[PDB]
Scaffold this motif. Structure first.
Motif, PDB file in Angstrom:
ATOM      1  N   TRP A  53       0.829  -1.196   0.000  1.00  0.00           N
ATOM      2  CA  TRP A  53       0.000   0.000   0.000  1.00  0.00           C
ATOM      3  C   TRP A  53       0.873   1.260   0.000  1.00  0.00           C
ATOM      4  O   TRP A  53       0.651   2.168  -0.795  1.00  0.00           O
ATOM      5  N   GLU A  54       1.883   1.278   0.872  1.00  0.00           N
ATOM      6  CA  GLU A  54       2.799   2.415   1.014  1.00  0.00           C
ATOM      7  C   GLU A  54       3.732   2.580  -0.193  1.00  0.00           C
ATOM      8  O   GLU A  54       4.066   3.705  -0.563  1.00  0.00           O
ATOM      9  N   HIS A  55       4.149   1.478  -0.814  1.00  0.00           N
ATOM     10  CA  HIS A  55       4.876   1.561  -2.090  1.00  0.00           C
ATOM     11  C   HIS A  55       4.046   2.302  -3.140  1.00  0.00           C
ATOM     12  O   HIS A  55       4.565   3.164  -3.841  1.00  0.00           O
ATOM     13  N   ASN A  56       2.761   1.949  -3.240  1.00  0.00           N
ATOM     14  CA  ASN A  56       1.807   2.591  -4.165  1.00  0.00           C
ATOM     15  C   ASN A  56       1.609   4.092  -3.907  1.00  0.00           C
ATOM     16  O   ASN A  56       1.678   4.888  -4.843  1.00  0.00           O
ATOM     17  N   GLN A  57       1.353   4.457  -2.646  1.00  0.00           N
ATOM     18  CA  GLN A  57       1.161   5.860  -2.260  1.00  0.00           C
ATOM     19  C   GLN A  57       2.264   6.709  -2.880  1.00  0.00           C
ATOM     20  O   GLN A  57       1.987   7.660  -3.618  1.00  0.00           O
ATOM     21  N   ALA A  58       3.514   6.322  -2.619  1.00  0.00           N
ATOM     22  CA  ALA A  58       4.692   7.033  -3.138  1.00  0.00           C
ATOM     23  C   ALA A  58       4.709   7.179  -4.661  1.00  0.00           C
ATOM     24  O   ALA A  58       5.315   8.106  -5.195  1.00  0.00           O
ATOM     25  N   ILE A  59       4.054   6.265  -5.359  1.00  0.00           N
ATOM     26  CA  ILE A  59       3.952   6.344  -6.820  1.00  0.00           C
ATOM     27  C   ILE A  59       2.888   7.371  -7.208  1.00  0.00           C
ATOM     28  O   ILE A  59       2.977   8.027  -8.254  1.00  0.00           O
ATOM     29  N   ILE A  60       1.891   7.491  -6.339  1.00  0.00           N
ATOM     30  CA  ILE A  60       0.759   8.375  -6.540  1.00  0.00           C
ATOM     31  C   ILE A  60       1.176   9.855  -6.385  1.00  0.00           C
ATOM     32  O   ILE A  60       0.585  10.734  -7.022  1.00  0.00           O
ATOM     33  N   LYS A 323       2.127  12.396   3.671  1.00  0.00           N
ATOM     34  CA  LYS A 323       1.403  11.484   2.751  1.00  0.00           C
ATOM     35  C   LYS A 323      -0.100  11.526   2.980  1.00  0.00           C
ATOM     36  O   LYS A 323      -0.891  11.180   2.098  1.00  0.00           O
ATOM     37  N   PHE A 324      -0.467  11.864   4.215  1.00  0.00           N
ATOM     38  CA  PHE A 324      -1.833  12.138   4.636  1.00  0.00           C
ATOM     39  C   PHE A 324      -2.859  12.195   3.517  1.00  0.00           C
ATOM     40  O   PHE A 324      -3.799  11.389   3.482  1.00  0.00           O
ATOM     41  N   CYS A 325      -2.709  13.140   2.600  1.00  0.00           N
ATOM     42  CA  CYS A 325      -3.787  13.337   1.651  1.00  0.00           C
ATOM     43  C   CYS A 325      -3.551  12.779   0.232  1.00  0.00           C
ATOM     44  O   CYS A 325      -4.380  12.969  -0.658  1.00  0.00           O
ATOM     45  N   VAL A 326      -2.459  12.044   0.033  1.00  0.00           N
ATOM     46  CA  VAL A 326      -2.412  11.067  -1.065  1.00  0.00           C
ATOM     47  C   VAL A 326      -3.411   9.949  -0.745  1.00  0.00           C
ATOM     48  O   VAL A 326      -4.083   9.428  -1.627  1.00  0.00           O
ATOM     49  N   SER A 327      -3.497   9.589   0.528  1.00  0.00           N
ATOM     50  CA  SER A 327      -4.525   8.683   0.980  1.00  0.00           C
ATOM     51  C   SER A 327      -5.895   9.292   0.668  1.00  0.00           C
ATOM     52  O   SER A 327      -6.660   8.724  -0.106  1.00  0.00           O
ATOM     53  N   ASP A 328      -6.179  10.451   1.261  1.00  0.00           N
ATOM     54  CA  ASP A 328      -7.481  11.118   1.120  1.00  0.00           C
ATOM     55  C   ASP A 328      -7.917  11.178  -0.345  1.00  0.00           C
ATOM     56  O   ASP A 328      -9.047  10.821  -0.680  1.00  0.00           O
ATOM     57  N   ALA A 336     -10.710   8.517 -10.148  1.00  0.00           N
ATOM     58  CA  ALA A 336     -10.065   9.637 -10.845  1.00  0.00           C
ATOM     59  C   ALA A 336      -8.582   9.392 -11.122  1.00  0.00           C
ATOM     60  O   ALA A 336      -8.105   9.789 -12.170  1.00  0.00           O
ATOM     61  N   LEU A 337      -7.876   8.717 -10.211  1.00  0.00           N
ATOM     62  CA  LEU A 337      -6.427   8.446 -10.338  1.00  0.00           C
ATOM     63  C   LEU A 337      -6.092   7.168 -11.083  1.00  0.00           C
ATOM     64  O   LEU A 337      -4.931   6.931 -11.441  1.00  0.00           O
ATOM     65  N   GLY A 338      -7.097   6.315 -11.266  1.00  0.00           N
ATOM     66  CA  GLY A 338      -6.881   4.971 -11.768  1.00  0.00           C
ATOM     67  C   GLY A 338      -6.063   4.956 -13.030  1.00  0.00           C
ATOM     68  O   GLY A 338      -5.024   4.305 -13.083  1.00  0.00           O
ATOM     69  N   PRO A 339      -6.527   5.666 -14.063  1.00  0.00           N
ATOM     70  CA  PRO A 339      -5.795   5.686 -15.305  1.00  0.00           C
ATOM     71  C   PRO A 339      -4.340   6.008 -15.081  1.00  0.00           C
ATOM     72  O   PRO A 339      -3.497   5.291 -15.592  1.00  0.00           O
ATOM     73  N   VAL A 342      -2.634   2.986 -13.393  1.00  0.00           N
ATOM     74  CA  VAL A 342      -2.343   1.757 -14.122  1.00  0.00           C
ATOM     75  C   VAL A 342      -1.415   1.980 -15.317  1.00  0.00           C
ATOM     76  O   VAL A 342      -0.670   1.059 -15.673  1.00  0.00           O
ATOM     77  N   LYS A 343      -1.441   3.171 -15.924  1.00  0.00           N
ATOM     78  CA  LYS A 343      -0.420   3.532 -16.927  1.00  0.00           C
ATOM     79  C   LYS A 343       0.984   3.296 -16.338  1.00  0.00           C
ATOM     80  O   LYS A 343       1.830   2.650 -16.964  1.00  0.00           O
ATOM     81  N   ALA A 344       1.191   3.789 -15.117  1.00  0.00           N
ATOM     82  CA  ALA A 344       2.463   3.672 -14.408  1.00  0.00           C
ATOM     83  C   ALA A 344       2.813   2.241 -13.966  1.00  0.00           C
ATOM     84  O   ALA A 344       3.963   1.782 -14.150  1.00  0.00           O
ATOM     85  N   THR A 345       1.839   1.542 -13.382  1.00  0.00           N
ATOM     86  CA  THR A 345       2.121   0.314 -12.641  1.00  0.00           C
ATOM     87  C   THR A 345       1.750  -0.995 -13.349  1.00  0.00           C
ATOM     88  O   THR A 345       2.244  -2.055 -12.973  1.00  0.00           O
ATOM     89  N   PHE A 346       0.901  -0.920 -14.374  1.00  0.00           N
ATOM     90  CA  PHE A 346       0.238  -2.105 -14.924  1.00  0.00           C
ATOM     91  C   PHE A 346       0.494  -2.311 -16.410  1.00  0.00           C
ATOM     92  O   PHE A 346      -0.196  -1.710 -17.258  1.00  0.00           O
ATOM     93  N   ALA A 347       1.482  -3.163 -16.718  1.00  0.00           N
ATOM     94  CA  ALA A 347       1.613  -3.713 -18.063  1.00  0.00           C
ATOM     95  C   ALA A 347       0.248  -4.301 -18.477  1.00  0.00           C
ATOM     96  O   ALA A 347      -0.460  -4.907 -17.660  1.00  0.00           O
ATOM     97  N   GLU A 348      -0.172  -4.062 -19.717  1.00  0.00           N
ATOM     98  CA  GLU A 348      -1.424  -4.641 -20.219  1.00  0.00           C
ATOM     99  C   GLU A 348      -1.212  -6.113 -20.405  1.00  0.00           C
ATOM    100  O   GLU A 348      -2.172  -6.926 -20.301  1.00  0.00           O
TER     101      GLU A 348
END
Ligand SMILES: CC(C)C[C@H](NP(=O)(O)O[C@@H]1O[C@@H](C)[C@H](O)[C@@H](O)[C@H]1O)C(=O)N[C@@H](Cc1c[nH]c2ccccc12)C(=O)O
Ligand SMILES: OCCCCC(CCO)CCCCO
Ligand SMILES: [Zn+2]
Length: 660
Positions: A53-60, A323-328, A336-339, A342-348
């Motif tokens: 979860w925390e690895h992801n936040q930092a990417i966000i 990081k507080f409001c990367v969570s929020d 809203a952030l999904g695209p 997944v562009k960043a993290t998810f090979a098709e």
């Protein structure tokens, strides 16, 4: 190679070779990790899920802090929401004013200063539809369990400012989180213009007393497992006799505007006597108190968006519970952030491979369904039929990768630069309107109750659907370079777990179209119930820190753990059957088939707060991590063959349980 070698090292790091696998496989697999990894500062329970979860936040952060403004309205709105909350030079300049203001627009409260008004159902309507609050009860719109192609209004219990009814009831005698919660109330009472503690203390105490009655009237989650027995549909005319305190047709007609509600509206009610008990409790108590309670709820929902005097209050209490409001932002605007996510993290690529892995787990699950001795063939035929119809989503919902569609969904939300609190409230009102707007629409499967960056997964009984957010399609669960044994042991088990939920003590009650309706003969149901009693008996044998683990309470998630471990291993055998054995890892002393069981266990490597364990042991429907491992492995003949655990070692019980 260097990837195998790095992955071997981390496997080996985590284990405790001083422990014998056939005695305690969890200790054997995680004892190294446990002893090394301490529960960090901001966390009270840590492990694989915490970690990823925390690895992801930092990417966000890097996604959200763009310069190019090369993203869509919806994506652009999350960036604005983010900047707005991150501008805390502004937030210290506003202080309590935003919330402290909002209150008076609502009519104020006896904490500031006197209060006396006939404004009850009005302020009740506002806080529920505008600020997405749920005092007294929670109202919302989801699939009708008995008619899955429709949505219905649902009234349920709610309104407790603690995580669980038992903190109000047990803790009175077993440690005073009550002291810590009254404190927190008192101090926020100050921050919002309450002056003298002698004046706040009593007021805030009465709210506590009322909140405990709420919890007294509330229903223990054991009396809330079985949907068939707690689903009660009533008309709005029946609801009005049942709970006369609220004037329901007016109430419903205002929060479900622009939809008209007449006396024949269907409303699903999960506890009739509760709602009766609410009404009496409403009609019996004085109004200031009713008002003070309602605002308190508002403040619990809202304080997070004010200054660092409050954060301190929230932090302090959570040590008893930027990081507080990367969570929020994820929380509220996650689709809203999904695209971006997944562009960043998810090979098709990943979607296609995850789709083949799902097919393979279903396959194996179904092959177990065909072979299950406790069902007649007719019941096995219906089960396959519902298995066959399970729908799956991978990564993200389709609509979010079409900016036209995603922007449409978020068009009525507006984010303002530097106005974090206003932004939040605006979102709360927007969010309420999205749910309200579903009342006369059909549910569909492209709508998720989880956003793509989440590290988790789920099954819906009403959509008969299994869902895997791109956020968990990550290491240790999945990695495309990783040995199949480890992919089938991580994600493969997560998949089987979700499939198995289609058939657990809850999910079996819903048919292949998602409807709550008997679709087996009672005989087969009686037969199912008998297999399950084994896992009750089994998991009530476990204890933690001198206290039992609850076997009835954890049954569903145990049933799913067991079906899924088992389907994943079979599937992995299937793969080896078709393709032939991959090579082995080097430093390890272990074959691939053993690696399977080990990888599985290492997903569940975890530490937690000594209080948390007494608590999870009563609130979490999931078993403690260690007994997820041990309870699963212990029902597997194949685990025991492969670690050659003797005839009645701990990890090799003769009373093995098997349902799916
Ligand atoms: C097998 C695992 C990958 C996912 C698995 N999902 P599942 O249990 O199907 O379903 C989960 O639990 C149900 C009770 C909830 O009602 C669901 O909405 C969902 O939270 C799970 O046990 N989740 C636990 C553990 C967990 C997974 N990811 C997490 C992230 C944070 C905290 C915990 C977790 C949970 O959500 O509680
Ligand atoms: O394809 C239909 C998508 C509609 C999206 C909403 C549906 C809620 O059930 C959710 C969006 C998040 C709002 O908070
Ligand atoms: Zn589950």
């Amino acid at each position: 190679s260097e990837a195998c070698v790095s992955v071997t090292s981390s496997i080996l790091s985590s284990m405790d070779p001083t422990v014998d696998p056939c005695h305690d496989f969890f200790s054997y697999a995680c004892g190294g990790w446990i002893k090394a990894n301490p529960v960090p500062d901001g966390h009270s329970r840590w492990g694989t899920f915490s970690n990823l979860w925390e690895h992801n936040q930092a990417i966000i952060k890097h996604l959200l802090e763009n310069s190019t403004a090369s993203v869509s309205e919806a994506e652009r709105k999350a960036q604005v929401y983010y900047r707005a909350c991150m501008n805390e030079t502004r937030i210290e300049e506003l202080r309590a004013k935003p919330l402290m203001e909002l209150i008076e627009r609502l009519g104020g409260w006896n904490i500031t200063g006197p209060w006396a008004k006939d404004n009850f159902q009005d302020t009740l309507q506002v806080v529920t539809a505008h600020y997405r609050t749920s005092p007294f009860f929670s109202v919302y719109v989801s699939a009708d369990s008995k008619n899955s192609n429709s949505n219905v209004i649902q009234v349920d219990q709610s309104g407790l400012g603690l995580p669980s009814r038992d903190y109000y009831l047990n803790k009175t005698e077993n440690e005073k989180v009550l002291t810590g919660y009254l404190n927190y109330m008192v101090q926020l009472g100050k921050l919002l213009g309450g002056g003298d503690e002698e004046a706040i203390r009593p007021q805030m105490q009465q709210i506590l007393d009322f909140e405990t009655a709420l919890a007294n009237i509330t229903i223990p989650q054991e009396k809330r497992r079985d949907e068939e027995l707690i689903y009660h549909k009533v008309t709005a005319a029946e609801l009005q006799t049942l709970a006369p305190a609220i004037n329901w047709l007016p109430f419903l007609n205002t929060i479900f505007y622009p939809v008209e509600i007449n006396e024949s509206e269907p409303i699903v009610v999960y506890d009739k006597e509760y709602l009766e008990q609410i009404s009496t409790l409403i009609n019996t108590t004085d109004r200031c108190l009713l008002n003070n309670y309602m605002i308190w709820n508002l403040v619990r929902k809202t304080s997070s968006f004010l200054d660092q005097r409050f954060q301190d209050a929230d932090e302090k209490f959570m040590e008893v519970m930027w990081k507080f409001c990367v969570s929020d932002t994820e929380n509220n605007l996650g689709f809203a952030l999904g695209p971006m996510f997944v562009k960043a993290t998810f090979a098709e690529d990943s979607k296609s491979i995850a789709t083949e892995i799902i097919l393979e787990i279903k396959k194996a699950f179904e092959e177990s369904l065909s072979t299950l001795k406790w069902m007649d063939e007719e019941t096995r035929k219906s089960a396959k039929e519902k298995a066959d119809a399970i729908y799956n989503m991978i990564g993200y919902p389709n609509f979010i990768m079409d900016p036209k569609e995603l922007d449409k969904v978020f068009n009525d939300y507006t984010a303002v630069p530097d106005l974090y609190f206003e932004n939040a409230m605006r979102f709360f009102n927007f969010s309420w309107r999205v749910t309200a707007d579903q009342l006369r629409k059909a549910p569909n499967r492209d709508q998720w109750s989880m956003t793509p960056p989440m590290v988790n997964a789920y099954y819906s009984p009403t959509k008969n659907e299994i869902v895997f957010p791109a956020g968990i399609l990550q290491a240790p669960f999945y990695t495309r370079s990783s040995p199949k044994a480890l992919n089938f042991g991580g994600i493969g088990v997560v998949v089987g777990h979700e499939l198995t939920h289609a058939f657990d003590d809850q999910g079996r009650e819903y048919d292949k179209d998602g409807n709550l309706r008997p679709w087996w003969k009672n005989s087969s149901v009686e037969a199912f119930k008998r297999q399950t009693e084994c896992m009750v008996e089994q998991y009530s044998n476990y204890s933690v820190n001198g206290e039992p683990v609850n076997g009835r309470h954890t049954l569903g998630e145990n049933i799913a753990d067991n079906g899924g471990l088992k389907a994943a291993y079979r599937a992995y055998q299937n793969w080896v059957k078709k393709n032939g054995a991959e090579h082995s890892l080097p430093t390890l002393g272990l074959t691939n088939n053993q690696l399977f069981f080990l990888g599985f266990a290492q997903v569940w490597c975890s530490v937690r707060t000594p209080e948390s364990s007494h608590e999870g042991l009563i609130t979490d429907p999931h078993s403690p991590s260690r007994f997820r491992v041990i309870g699963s492995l212990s029902n597997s003949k194949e685990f025991s063959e492969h670690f050659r655990c003797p005839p009645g070692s701990p990890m090799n019980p003769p009373h093995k349980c098997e349902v799916w």
